[PDB]
Amino acid sequence: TTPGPVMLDVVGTTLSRDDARRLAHPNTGGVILFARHFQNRAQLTALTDSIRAVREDILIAVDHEGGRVQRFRTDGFTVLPAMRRLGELWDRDVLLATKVATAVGYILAAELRACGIDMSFTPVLDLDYGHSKVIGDRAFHRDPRVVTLLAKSLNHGLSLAGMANCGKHFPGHGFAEADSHVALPTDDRTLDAILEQDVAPYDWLGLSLAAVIPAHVIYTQVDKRPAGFSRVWLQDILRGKLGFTGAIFSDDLSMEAAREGGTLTQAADAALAAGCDMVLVCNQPDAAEVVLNGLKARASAESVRRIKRMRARGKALKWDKLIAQPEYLQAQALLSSAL
Numbered sequence: 001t002t003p004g005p006v007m008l009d010v011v012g013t014t015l016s017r018d019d020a021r022r023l024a025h026p027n028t029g030g031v032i033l034f035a036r037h038f039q040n041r042a043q044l045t046a047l048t049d050s051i052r053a054v055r056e057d058i059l060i061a062v063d064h065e066g067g068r069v070q071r072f073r074t075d076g077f078t079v080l081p082a083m084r085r086l087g088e089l090w091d092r093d094v095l096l097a098t099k100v101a102t103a104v105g106y107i108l109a110a111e112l113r114a115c116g117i118d119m120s121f122t123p124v125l126d127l128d129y130g131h132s133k134v135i136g137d138r139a140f141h142r143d144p145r146v147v148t149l150l151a152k153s154l155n156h157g158l159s160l161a162g163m164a165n166c167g168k169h170f171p172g173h174g175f176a177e178a179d180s181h182v183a184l185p186t187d188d189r190t191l192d193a194i195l196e197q198d199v200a201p202y203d204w205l206g207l208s209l210a211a212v213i214p215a216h217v218i219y220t221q222v223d224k225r226p227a228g229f230s231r232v233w234l235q236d237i238l239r240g241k242l243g244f245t246g247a248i249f250s251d252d253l254s255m256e257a258a259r260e261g262g263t264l265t266q267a268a269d270a271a272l273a274a275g276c277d278m279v280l281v282c283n284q285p286d287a288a289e290v291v292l293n294g295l296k297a298r299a300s301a302e303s304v305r306r307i308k309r310m311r312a313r314g315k316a317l318k319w320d321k322l323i324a325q326p327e328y329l330q331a332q333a334l335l336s337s338a339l
């Protein structure tokens with residue numbers, strides 16, 4: 001069986017019969033985990049094992065950015081700094097910042113893989129204009145060059161553990177004022193202005209960028225549709241001008257900014273038609289199940305290639321081996337001293 005276009009979540013800390021039904025649906029391709037799915041490492045590993053036992057080709061992801069966005073913070077998961085902290089270190093010591101960024105990525109990826117997780121939805125590539133509270137300290141730096149090189153260093157650390165990455169929120173959530181969870185933000189700058197700064201990290205990263213999540217933001221001078229529903233942003237700019245061939249995941253369609261003029265299913269259809277390879281439906285699995293069964297048919301072969309390439313690569317150390325690894329311990333000691 002092959003991955004479908006829908007990433008959803010499960011109801012609890014252990015899999016239910018309803019979960020298993022959804023996980024077996026052809027249009028399911030991923031599971032995203034949140035804090036409520038975590039009690040301890042043993043429980044989490046059993047949960048991810050049981051998910052893959054139902055759907056071997058499934059992709060399991062989580063929001064592990066660090067700082068204010070890190071679902072698992074206890075039972076041995078290292079509480080990671082906010083990415084803004086690495087930009088502040090950069091302003092004191094550029095090279096040391098790149099070294100610490102890689103150490104963060106390696107800790108981040110290695111701990112998640114020890115619990116059977118494929119990937120984290122990181123790094124944030126939004127620029128730290130100071131305008132966006134929802135991003136806030138989740139952004140690395142104000143300078144797109146600095147964001148690029150810090151994010152690349154982080155992604156290198158993730159790769160060291162075989163983990164991919166996913167930049168967000170394309171083409172940039174840093175300039176708009178509002179929070180797309182609860183409102184519909186807007187960005188009234190020109191296309192060229194947006195491309196010169198906010199999009200430059202996506203272009204400069206090249207092959208070091210594995211995937212993208214678009215923002216639920218309306219860039220009124222470029223397209224009236226939010227970026228995640230915009231063929232202009234996802235195909236004309238990201239796939240065309242930038243030549244990007246990695247996976248595109250929609251930001252959560254349950255968010256207020258994603259409610260356009262109809263149902264969740266129609267929003268999913270629109271995101272996929274616009275250029276998303278996967279759509280996320282979070283915090284309402286029964287509503288996700290309606291999307292699974294109502295999704296309009298579409299060409300998916302090119303999408304499936306990209307989705308499978310987001311699976312973690314190679315073997316992963318289990319916790320009992322990782323806790324003793326010199327490289328893991330070196331990275332832990334660097335984080336404690338440099339910050």
Ligand SMILES: *[C@H]1[C@H](O)[C@H](CO)[C@@H](O)[C@H](O)[C@H]1NC(=O)C(F)(F)F
Pocket residue numbers: 032063121134135168169173179180181213215216251252280282
């Ligand atoms: C939308 C979704 O919540 C996904 C998956 O949970 C996040 O990775 C993503 O960061 C998020 N969007 C935002 O936080 C923001 F900034 F766009 F509002």
